[PDB]
Amino acid sequence: TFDDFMIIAANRDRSENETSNMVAFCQVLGQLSLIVRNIGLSENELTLL
Amino acid sequence: TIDGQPLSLSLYATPADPSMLLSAAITASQGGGDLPHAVMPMYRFPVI
Incomplete structure (x- = not known):
């Protein structure tokens, strides 16, 4: 979730699965950023859905 | 035609x-900003 990504962050001592999960989280975030700014959504349409 | x-x-x-x-x-x-709870300080009015 968004919680337990903050806890995997702010440690600087994590497992390879932990940094892989945080990297997958950040890449899904980047995919969502692209999927929003490519189609054009000023959030009044987006946060409704 | 032909x-x-x-x-x-x-x-x-x-x-x-x-x-x-x-x-x-x-x-x-x-929404707008809602007002928090006010605390009374120890200093007088020009200082605060």
Whole structure:
């Protein structure tokens, strides 16, 4: 979730699965950023859905 | 005709006009800032 990504962050001592999960989280975030700014959504349409 | 070419000319259909593109700016409305709880300090009015 968004919680337990903050806890995997702010440690600087994590497992390879932990940094892989945080990297997958950040890449899904980047995919969502692209999927929003490519189609054009000023959030009044987006946060409704 | 004698050569097979038609006497009556063909119909020329009208092509579709280029449409005008439309955009819009949808707007949002978030809540305002609500006032917190006030604490009384130790200093006088010009200091505070």
